[PDB]
Design a binder for these strands. Structure first.
Length: 157
DNA sequence: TACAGATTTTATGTTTAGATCTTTTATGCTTGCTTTTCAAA
């Protein structure tokens, strides 16, 4: 598996072509390249770092269609194990959980979360009522209005 | 004015909460030396 081999050396072309497999814009891929170039000589398994960075970027870039459809979350992680030569899925989840704490406090990741409105999966208007202890926050019991509208369109079609 | 009772004043004892200083002991930095896994060939 690609998550096991150590001390690999990579080119910029491999990183920028692996970034375009998941449909990322140019500046996000450039920030992924720069985050790799900062920690170039102080790295053990670069494939894990690149995999988890392109993951944590493509949940943020594709959060709204993940809210539209949940199985895309099972589609991006299925595309990753079909490229990283890894049989199981839990290694990729532990990989992204491990690389998440390395970029959490940085300015570019904060600006990405601001610009694409991810904030660990929910809007600012929802997270400011969840942290305040507002009981009037939207609970995860009923479906959303857009989901009800597209379901009613599916019924009428 | 006048005296009985209530309250204040002054004085001392009892117990608790806490400060300050002193002494002995733990701990952390410094320097030198030796062990032991780690990225590279």
């Amino acid at each position: 598996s690609l998550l096991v081999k150590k001390y690999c050396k990579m080119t910029t072309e491999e990183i920028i072509r692996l970034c375009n497999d998941f449909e990322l814009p140019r500046e996000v891929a450039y920030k992924i390249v720069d985050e790799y170039n900062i920690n170039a000589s102080r790295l053990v398994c670069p494939w894990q770092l690149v995999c988890g960075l392109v993951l944590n970027c493509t949940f943020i870039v594709f959060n709204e269609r993940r809210r539209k459809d949940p199985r895309i979350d099972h589609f991006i992680v299925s595309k990753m194990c079909s490229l990283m030569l890894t049989s199981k899925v839990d290694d990729v989840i532990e990989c992204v959980k491990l690389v998440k704490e390395l970029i959490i406090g940085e300015k570019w990741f904060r600006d990405l979360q601001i610009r694409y409105d991810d904030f660990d999966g929910i809007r600012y208007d929802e997270i400011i009522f969840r942290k305040l202890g507002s009981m009037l926050q939207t609970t995860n019991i009923l479906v959303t209005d857009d989901q009800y509208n597209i379901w009613k369109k599916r019924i009428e079609m």
